[PDB]
Amino acid sequence: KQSHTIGLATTNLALHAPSQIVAAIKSRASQMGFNVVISMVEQGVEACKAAVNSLLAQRVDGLIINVPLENEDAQAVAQACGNVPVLFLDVSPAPVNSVLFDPHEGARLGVEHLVALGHQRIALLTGPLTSVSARLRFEGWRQTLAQHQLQPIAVLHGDWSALSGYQQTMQMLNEGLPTALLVANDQMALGALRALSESGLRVPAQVSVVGYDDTEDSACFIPPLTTIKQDFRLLGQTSVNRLVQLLQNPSAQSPQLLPVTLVKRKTTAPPENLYFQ
Amino acid sequence: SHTIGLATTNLALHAPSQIVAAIKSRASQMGFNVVISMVEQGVEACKAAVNSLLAQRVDGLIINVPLENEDAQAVAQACGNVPVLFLDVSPAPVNSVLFDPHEGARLGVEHLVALGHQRIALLTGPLTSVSARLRFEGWRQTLAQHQLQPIAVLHGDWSALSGYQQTMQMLNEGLPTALLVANDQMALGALRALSESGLRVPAQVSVVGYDDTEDSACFIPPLTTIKQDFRLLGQTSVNRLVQLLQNPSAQSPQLLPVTLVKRKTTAPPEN
Ligand SMILES: CO[C@@H]1O[C@H](CO)[C@H](O)[C@H](O)[C@H]1O
Numbered sequence: 116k117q118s119h120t121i122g123l124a125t126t127n128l129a130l131h132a133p134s135q136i137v138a139a140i141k142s143r144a145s146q147m148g149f150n151v152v153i154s155m156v157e158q159g160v161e162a163c164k165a166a167v168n169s170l171l172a173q174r175v176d177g178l179i180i181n182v183p184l185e186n187e188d189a190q191a192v193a194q195a196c197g198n199v200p201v202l203f204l205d206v207s208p209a210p211v212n213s214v215l216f217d218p219h220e221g222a223r224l225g226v227e228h229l230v231a232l233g234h235q236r237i238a239l240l241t242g243p244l245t246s247v248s249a250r251l252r253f254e255g256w257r258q259t260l261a262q263h264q265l266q267p268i269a270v271l272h273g274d275w276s277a278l279s280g281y282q283q284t285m286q287m288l289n290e291g292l293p294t295a296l297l298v299a300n301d302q303m304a305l306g307a308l309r310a311l312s313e314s315g316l317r318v319p320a321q322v323s324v325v326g327y328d329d330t331e332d333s334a335c336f337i338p339p340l341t342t343i344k345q346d347f348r349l350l351g352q353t354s355v356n357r358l359v360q361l362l363q364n365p366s367a368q369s370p371q372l373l374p375v376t377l378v379k380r381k382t383t384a385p386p387e388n389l390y391f392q
Numbered sequence: 393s394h395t396i397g398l399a400t401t402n403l404a405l406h407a408p409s410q411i412v413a414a415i416k417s418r419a420s421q422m423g424f425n426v427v428i429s430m431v432e433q434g435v436e437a438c439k440a441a442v443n444s445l446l447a448q449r450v451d452g453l454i455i456n457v458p459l460e461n462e463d464a465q466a467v468a469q470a471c472g473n474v475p476v477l478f479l480d481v482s483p484a485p486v487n488s489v490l491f492d493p494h495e496g497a498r499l500g501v502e503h504l505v506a507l508g509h510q511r512i513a514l515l516t517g518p519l520t521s522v523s524a525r526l527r528f529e530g531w532r533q534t535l536a537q538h539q540l541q542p543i544a545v546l547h548g549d550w551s552a553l554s555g556y557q558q559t560m561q562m563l564n565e566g567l568p569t570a571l572l573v574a575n576d577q578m579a580l581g582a583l584r585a586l587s588e589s590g591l592r593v594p595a596q597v598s599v600v601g602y603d604d605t606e607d608s609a610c611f612i613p614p615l616t617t618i619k620q621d622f623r624l625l626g627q628t629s630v631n632r633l634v635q636l637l638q639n640p641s642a643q644s645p646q647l648l649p650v651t652l653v654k655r656k657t658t659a660p661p662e663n
């Protein structure tokens with residue numbers, strides 16, 4: 116019997132993007148007459164499978180999985196859900212149902228923006244390489260730079276937090292001087308802005324910075340952050356609608372893509388003294 | 393084998409999200425699952441969340457939703473026999489676990505007065521929230537202990553953008569030397585408004601936030617703020633719920649202390 120309850124397994128809610136995704140899923144679910152029951156998990160098939168079985172024991176109608184998973188591990192989670200519809204929001208190419216922001220396009224937009232402004236010395240601050248999302252953003256950056264015959268001047272790895280963005284940017288400035296930094300999320304970009312400011316490098320006159328997500332606070336960073344927007348409202352609307360559609364007509368697995376956009380604010384400019392005035 | 397149900401307000405605000413994470417951490421260490429229901433404002437929405445969580449057959453409930461005690465009584469009534477703990481209620485009911493609701497306000501006023509400020513503005517949370525109201529009342533009362541009135545009182549909605557807009561509004565009407573802000577997200581917006589207005593922080597305007605949510609040490613400048621230890625709140629609330637499940641003896645409210653974390657956003661007033 117249907118219960119009008121959707122189960123949501125989610126990675127660390129202390130990161131801003133997953134919490135905005137929960138909020139957007141709850142909002143659409145409420146408009147569609149569904150309650151949402153949320154389980155927060157750590158990495159691993161076992162942690163995800165345990166979350167699924169408990170929800171299925173309490174008769175949830177369908178599941179949404181927002182946890183970073185590689186191909187094989189995503190297949191194992193999908194398998195555990197039995198015949199309950201299940202959707203994934205953070206997976207590599209996998210034979211599973213997914214609703215994804217285009218992982219390569221966000222990286223491409225960031226490189227193209229900086230290259231068009233004239234930058235040639237671009238550093239990359241990735242997320243944790245255990246994350247499929249962080250890996251695909253890194254690969255997209257490297258590939259798009261190579262299409263312009265550029266190599267990144269530095270590549271460092273953070274953990275999605277602001278403090279890691281600060282620490283990795285400080286380390287980057289010990290080894291070289293980029294004119295622009297691509298950062299894999301907005302929280303790390305906040306820490307990079309702090310490191311640049313406290314090192315006497317003005318943003319964007321001396322160093323440009325691009326974030327990723329457009330989480331809510333970023334329009335109020337100093338300076339307001341230029342970033343790749345992932346519209347979490349639309350993700351929440353789309354996933355809840357795809358789950359309702361999967362309850363009515365059980366269908367083959369499909370990967371579905373949502374657009375990303377570059378939001379131009381106040382952290383990018385041409386490289387220092389290209390247009391000295 | 394055991395599951396805790398957690399009702400929470402909007403997870404897009406950083407403090408409730410850190411509280412969820414802290415509750416999940418302690419619950420997992422004690423072998424318990426946590427299932428979460430997100431609530432809009434009001435007693436009806438909280439009752440609906442409680443009913444959803446009871447339908448998950450949970451063993452106990454933790455409510456992190458700002459409630460007047462009369463509505464908390466109605467929410468407790470909807471829990472029935474299932475033990476329930478509140479994290480944001482005034483008057484603080486029996487069994488509850490909550491941060492001291494006035495100590496943070498007192499510490500912030502006392503710090504700015506100790507630095508020599510006399511022209512202190514307040515940027516409150518939404519007065520619909522018990523926590524925002526108690527912080528406002530605490531600020532006013534501590535200022536009155538120094539024979540001061542706030543030079544301005546502005547009202548935000550807990551978001552950074554509201555901190556920006558309210559700080560721009562405040563600067564259209566006057567010029568304080570210090571600003572007490574009811575949370576760190578609004579303080580971020582306040583810093584942006586001061587910076588873009590050409591008011592140096594802290595040399596011309598001092599700013600104090602509230603929460604010490606994770607990003608705040610990386611604001612420009614790093615934010616002086618009232619720390620609410622959300623790790624300790626999660627640990628203590630789960631421990632108290634377990635004690636209630638083991639022995640239903642009702643316990644006095646437990647008030648957790650808060651502290652001032654001095655970073656880089658305060659200084660004496662421009663003389
Ligand atoms: C939605 O994708 C990514 O999710 C991560 C957590 O797994 C981080 O929150 C990143 O900021 C976000 O870009």
Ligand SMILES: CO[C@@H]1O[C@H](CO)[C@H](O)[C@H](O)[C@H]1O
Nearest residue numbers: 401405407408523550575603
């Ligand atoms: C924990 O108390 C308060 O909760 C609010 C939401 O209800 C906001 O998140 C505030 O920042 C926080 O200080």
